[PDB]
Symmetry: C3
Subunit: 179 residues, 3 copies
């Protein structure tokens, strides 16, 4: 598993090698970090009551993995994998879950059920990856669809976090000092 070729700080990317602190590798790594959190959250959504959300998450892990591949491409040796079609799929689901969840009355704070809490954490990591992608874009040309996808994904995560709390008979945690 270990080749030791990266022991000095450089690593391999599609079409070349770069320093491990290259913004391209930071973006790629944070996408991986975000994908890991979704993997954890998924171990809490295996029940029948969450088949819909769980299957979508499995697919999202593949798409997130594809985002990584699209970003770690110094020399375009292959077309991009992430397409606008995948963003629209996220959009259709977000509309469905916003309809399912109760009306949003107050500002939401991350937390509630264990499952929703983990999804809330994954959401913040996805947002941190988005900032890295924005930085990357400032230096090199990127698959702009990846930025739209990661941007839309945190909204999807926000949507299901609320649906998850609702299904589990737990109210969302709200910003409310009158409570």
């Amino acid at each position: 598993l270990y080749t030791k070729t990266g022991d000095k700080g450089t690593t391999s990317v599609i079409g070349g090698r770069v320093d491990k602190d290259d913004i391209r590798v930071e973006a790629y790594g944070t996408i991986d970090e975000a994908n890991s959190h979704i993997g954890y959250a998924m171990t809490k959504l295996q029940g029948g009551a969450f088949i819909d959300i769980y299957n979508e998450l499995e697919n999202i892990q593949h798409e997130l993995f594809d985002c990584g591949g699209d970003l770690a491409i110094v020399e375009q040796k292959i077309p991009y994998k992430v397409t606008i079609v995948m963003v629209e799929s996220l959009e259709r689901k977000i509309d469905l879950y916003i309809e399912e969840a109760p009306p949003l009355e107050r500002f939401i704070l991350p937390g509630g059920s264990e499952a929703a809490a983990t999804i809330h954490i994954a959401r913040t990591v996805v947002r941190r990856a988005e900032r890295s992608i924005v930085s990357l874009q400032k230096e090199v040309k990127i698959n702009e669809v990846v930025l739209k996808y990661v941007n839309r994904l945190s909204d999807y995560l926000f949507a299901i976090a609320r649906v998850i709390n609702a299904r589990l008979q737990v109210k969302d945690v709200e910003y409310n000092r009158s409570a």
Copy 2:
């Protein structure tokens, strides 16, 4: 009620009093505060027992103060009064002395972990400190509510303190760094 507007699909976003790139140090500080807040929210799910009523309510309040920190940090040129005050920082200090007093004597570095609850608080602790580094960067570019830096600095001590109390109440002994002379 439609979450996505797509206005941020190109990398820019809104802040209080203007628009900036999503990788602006300001948005990063704000985002990391949110990240820290999410870890505290997860940790809380493990602290609803009757043995942690005091800590749970404090974390509940802290989620609000942390959210307020993000609001103060996302304010450009200050169109509204800041929300984070020294009073909230002092409240943190009084609790820390209380928890240090409750926990067994601390004489050396300890491994972060133990109980599931304390482990999560320890992670939240590191994310808060990460947020602190971003706030420090922010302050070098623009004027901020300096109280927010004090609060974030002090909050990680609070988290360190309750993590040890949680393990203690759960009878999980701290593991001291094996470099015994440190």
Copy 3:
């Protein structure tokens, strides 16, 4: 006592051999090692089974070694002796060889997830790799104990290897990229 001294309220803090701003790359590397160590601490709570005493015990040791990594990185101009040596890196290598042998043959690309224990280890893996990127950035500004870079590099491989062994022992298949 007073855990807080308030000397850091203005944005500066001390390292071994001086004081610097908290956003200095040295403090960031140090901080991210602490973050990675904390994630390992959480993962360990999921590996308390009698079937995981070996992995748990090795992770506990790694936590001490991560503290050594932290200390080494905080040393300004070799104010004091470095503690992380090549011996610890090779120790990781031997365990990796053993775990690759234990786990089933790796055929497809793995996505982070599976058993909750493995899922949490995968997350810790990404944080370790994030810590590595900061160390690489630090090394570009100052001379560091190069062995810490090798250790942190090899560490993520160790974590990846035990994640798979953990799923295997729990009789859970690894989540693989497959659509």
